[PDB]
């Protein structure tokens, strides 16, 4: 009636002495089973033995934990044993232990700084999860590039899983980027740098603009240039540019000046609004062997005469290809019981595909060709008919393919982008599989999302019964996040595809969700595949600030009302934005900490184990051959079942087949940026009342610009917290 | 003799190579190494290449 | 399965086949050349197998 299938879902990744979900599959009932995953040592003392009461048709996942290891990493062999009363089976795989750490980072006002000041910085620690973590440290120190520690503290402990600091500064350091150092008890190194320079602020504010990406056909170059040396005085005078076609063709012995052109669309500087300029690309002869351009502006000053020149935007953009299209949501892998959606769009300079440009959908080897055209957004969506072999490789054009060069030099050259794709199949010995469409688009949080996926069942069901089972599963941070299950209705012969599913979006998942579902069968074949989904940045504890409103200067008395979970600790870096405008937070965001996270996923193969040996081989089963002919031994490159276990990112131990090409050994063979005041306005720490604290802000008058906070909050009552943006005028 | 370009080439398993039975010691090879022909409903005759 | 020449008898041997059509046998199957460096690549050491 039912042949048993067992499968124990075992992320070989071990986050230590922490809850990490693991689980099992069993169905099609049989006598008795109480299996045990034992990571026995050479002796059997380092056994990570977890024997557990088991049954059929159930999902009930224990997140047991493990004490510390001897090494930081150590491969140990894992023979889960099939504790049946009359059947016992093993298979040894290395386990990817790791004495992994709790995670940390650093906060500073800036990286560049001013000489002679005191830097102010803070330090943080949390865990795998995004909750705080109070804990000591070995040490900390700032280091200078000369191999030496300019600042240091020793083995403090955190009040709330963080600490704030400062450090003075000499006015005579080495002008260079300096850095800070901490080591965990393991030796866990984090790094957050900081430079200093009292470079002279250039008086002038000469600013140029120009189009970047050019093509084989243009008409206009709408170039805006304006110099307000103080940001608020565009001088009444003249301006002249030097813009020039340039670039000897990779030749330097020419002994001359390689300017192909030099035009000066000079003009009278107007204080109204700004000077602007609008130059044409025709006189520049925007031709193929009309060579690269360079841009350099003569910004002359009135009643001073100390004229400035600036080479900005100068390095032109040799657009070797013209009419550049791409893919959009092209299914990286496809299937055979469905005509399926790839997608492609187009961009060109400004990023404007011609409306209703019709295309040449060269999706072949099924020779399903059927033209289409661009939607509003360049895009296009399309199924393609399916009775062919595993390999399929597709492409689409508006132009047509030419492989027609006359002579192998072709210094003469031209190109148009083509979105060609190669694809491979899925298994289906089990005679049922799904195609889970991707959600590779917008993803708001604090919701759920019914997924769209379409099962088949080849040959209907050979027997099946009234009801089989299907389960949908997601890994997270080395542990499964949730347990998804379902069943379908009764039918003995059909090809249906209207399956139901959903999952709630909050948090608690890698930046992706390798969601996986599979086709549990009574006949020892199970077919699935992962399904990777975006995880857009959203936090446990949201929060927002608000200030005593932005008004005239002198009013020192202000506020900064901030309102979050009832209890927390909080950074309060109320600062000037223009210094952050100067150098954006290329190294700070909520998304940052999501990705400053290391080891979000790690397929278990990684470095330590090159592979896993298993029992069968390809030469085996030397019994009668095909009746029609002789079928030798060979295989397919298509995406596979055993690998869907590693596409999940884990291993397992099973009787349902993964029988495919292992091997036989020896068969028969035997730039410069503007700056204003670096003055860091506010920097402090507070704790929220239950109702949302508000701190009287102190105006820094007599300095008007864009203003902003670098604040941040934290607690275990709701995890960390950030209102990632609220500026001030 | 066969006048057949091909039969069911495309198959899940390995594509059979020969239209008719060809081997070093096949069945009709016994009739050939005899040197005699025959006319039969069982599987004997072939063209060579 | 090694054997030996009888004074009155030659080798009378069987091998148990459990595989596909492609087969081939030999004896004195230890080396074809006693010495591969033989000399100046000018005269090949050949003994019957
Ligand atoms: C390519 O696309 C076409 C649809 O335009 C798919 O054709 C579909 O094929 C299935 C299976 O043959 C059809 O179901 C049954 O077909 C038989 C044909 O004799 C019919 O007698 C049954 O009543 C039943 O309809 C299905 O009807 C058909 N699509 C439509 C129009 O309903 C085809 O499967 C696609 N390529 C492949 C083979 O993946
Ligand atoms: C001729 C020229 O300078 N090109 C464009 C012009 O087509 C457009 O009307 C204008 C609007 O600001 O921007 C510029
Ligand atoms: C194993 C095999 O297929 N080869 C033959 C087998 O058919 C035969 O029955 C046996 C008798 O000892 O000799 C061997
Ligand atoms: C279940 O599977 C085992 C192994 O094939 C077998 O020994 C047993 O007879 C099967 N049936 C039951 C009901 O135990
Ligand atoms: C196993 O070895 C460890 C090493 O510390 C020891 O503590 C323990 O007592 C030994 N035996 C067990 C499993 O208790
Ligand atoms: C030759 O085969 C016999 C019969 O089994 C065996 O006893 C003997 O060890 C073999 N001789 C050699 C070369 O060892």
Curated annotation (Swiss-Prot), chain A:
Compartments, record wording: Secreted
Annotated tissue distribution: Secreted in plasma.
Region feature (Inhibitory): 672-677
Glycosylation site list: 30, 45, 222, 371, 385
Annotated crosslink Isoglutamyl lysine isopeptide (Gln-Lys) (interchain with K-? in other proteins) location: 668-669
Disulfide bonds: 23-61, 226-274, 244-262, 445-538, 570-713, 617-664
Chain's role: Is able to inhibit all four classes of proteinases by a unique 'trapping' mechanism. This protein has a peptide stretch, called the 'bait region' which contains specific cleavage sites for different proteinases. When a proteinase cleaves the bait region, a conformational change is induced in the protein which traps the proteinase. The entrapped enzyme remains active against low molecular weight substrates (activity against high molecular weight substrates is greatly reduced).
Assembly and interaction partners: Homotetramer; disulfide-linked.
Protein name: Alpha-2-macroglobulin
Lineage: Eukaryota, Metazoa, Chordata, Craniata, Vertebrata
Swiss-Prot record, chain B:
Tissue: Secreted in plasma.
Location in the cell: Secreted
Subunit structure: Homotetramer; disulfide-linked.
Homology family: Belongs to the protease inhibitor I39 (alpha-2-macroglobulin) family.
General function of this protein: Is able to inhibit all four classes of proteinases by a unique 'trapping' mechanism. This protein has a peptide stretch, called the 'bait region' which contains specific cleavage sites for different proteinases. When a proteinase cleaves the bait region, a conformational change is induced in the protein which traps the proteinase. The entrapped enzyme remains active against low molecular weight substrates (activity against high molecular weight substrates is greatly reduced).
Protein name, UniProt field: Alpha-2-macroglobulin
Lineage per the UniProt record: Eukaryota, Metazoa, Chordata, Craniata, Vertebrata
Residues of the full protein shown: 640 to 688 of 1474
């Amino acid at each position: 009636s039912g042949k048993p299938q067992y499968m124990v879902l075992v992320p070989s990744l071990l986050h230590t002495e922490t809850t990490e979900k693991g689980c099992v599959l069993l169905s099609y009932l049989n006598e008795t089973v109480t299996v045990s995953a034992s990571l026995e040592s050479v002796r059997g003392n380092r056994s990570l033995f977890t024997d557990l009461e088991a049954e059929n048709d159930v999902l009930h996942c224990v997140a047991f934990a493990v004490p510390k290891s001897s090494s930081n990493e150590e491969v140990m062999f894992l023979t889960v044993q099939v504790k049946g009363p009359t059947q016992e089976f093993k298979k040894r795989t290395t386990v990817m232990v790791k004495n992994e750490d709790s995670l940390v980072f650093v906060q500073t006002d800036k990286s560049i700084y001013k000489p002679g000041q005191t830097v102010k910085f803070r330090v943080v620690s949390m865990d795998e999860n995004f909750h705080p973590l109070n804990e000591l440290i070995p040490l900390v120190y700032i280091q200078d590039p000369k191999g030496n520690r300019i600042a240091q503290w020793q083995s403090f402990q955190l009040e709330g899983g963080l600490k704030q600091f400062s450090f003075p500064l000499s006015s005579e350091p080495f002008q260079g980027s300096y850095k800070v150092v901490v080591q965990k008890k393991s030796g866990g190194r984090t790094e957050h740098p900081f430079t200093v320079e009292e470079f002279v602020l250039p008086k002038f504010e000469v600013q140029v603009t120009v189009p970047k990406i050019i093509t084989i056909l243009e008409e206009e170059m709408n170039v805006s240039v304006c110099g307000l040396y103080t940001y608020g005085k565009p001088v009444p005078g003249h301006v002249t540019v030097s813009i020039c076609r340039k670039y000897s063709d990779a030749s330097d012995c020419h002994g001359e000046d390689s300017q192909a052109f030099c035009e000066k669309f000079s003009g009278q500087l107007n204080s109204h609004g700004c000077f602007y300029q609008q130059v044409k690309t025709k006189v520049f002869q925007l031709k193929r062997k009309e060579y690269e351009m360079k841009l350099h502006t003569e910004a002359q000053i009135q009643e001073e005469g100390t004229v400035v020149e600036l080479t900005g935007r100068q390095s032109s953009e040799i657009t070797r290809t013209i009419t550049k299209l791409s893919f959009v949501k092209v299914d990286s892998h496809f299937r055979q019981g469905i005509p399926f959606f790839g997608q492609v769009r187009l961009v060109d300079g400004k990023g404007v595909p011609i409306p209703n440009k019709v295309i040449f959908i060269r999706g072949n080897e099924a020779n399903y060709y059927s033209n289409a055209t661009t939607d509003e957004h360049g895009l296009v969506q399309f199924s393609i008919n399916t009775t062919n072999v595993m390999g399929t490789s597709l492409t689409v054009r508006v132009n047509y393919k030419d492989r027609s060069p006359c002579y192998g030099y072709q210094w003469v050259s031209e190109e148009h982008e083509e979105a060609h794709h190669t694809a491979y199949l899925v298994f289906s010995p089990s005679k049922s599989f799904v195609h889970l469409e991707p959600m590779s688009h917008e993803l708001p949080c604090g919701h759920t999302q019914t997924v769209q996926a379409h099962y088949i069942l080849n040959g209907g069901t050979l027997l099946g019964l009234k009801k089989l089972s299907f389960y949908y599963l997601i890994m997270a941070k080395g542990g499964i996040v949730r347990t998804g299950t379902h069943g379908l209705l009764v039918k003995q012969e059909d090809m249906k595809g209207h399956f139901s599913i959903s999952i709630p979006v909050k948090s608690d998942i890698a930046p992706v969700a390798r969601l996986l579902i599979y086709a549990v069968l009574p006949t020892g074949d199970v077919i699935g595949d992962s399904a990777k989904y975006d995880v857009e940045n959203c936090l446990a504890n949201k929060v927002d600030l608000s200030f005593s409103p932005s008004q005239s200067l002198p009013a020192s008395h202000a506020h900064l009302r901030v309102t979050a979970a009832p209890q927390s600790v909080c950074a309060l870096r109320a600062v000037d934005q223009s210094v952050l405008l100067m150098k954006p937070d290329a190294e700070l965001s909520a998304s940052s900490v999501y990705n400053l996270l290391p080891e979000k996923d790690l397929t278990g193969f990684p470095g330590p184990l090159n592979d896993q040996d298993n029992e069968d081989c390809i030469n085996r089963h030397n019994v009668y051959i095909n009746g029609i002919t002789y079928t030798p031994v060979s295989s397919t490159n298509e995406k596979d079942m055993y690998s869907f276990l590693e596409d999940m990112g884990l291993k397992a131990f099973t009787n349902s087949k993964i029988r495919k090409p292992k091997m036989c050994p020896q068969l028969q063979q035997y730039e410069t940026v503007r700056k204003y005041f670096p003055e860091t306005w506010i920097w402090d720490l507070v704790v929220v009342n239950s109702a949302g604290v508000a701190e009287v802000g102190v105006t820094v008058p007599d300095t008007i610009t864009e203003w902003k906070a670098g604040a941040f909050c934290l607690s275990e009552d709701a995890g960390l917290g950030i209102s990632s943006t609220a500026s001030l005028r």
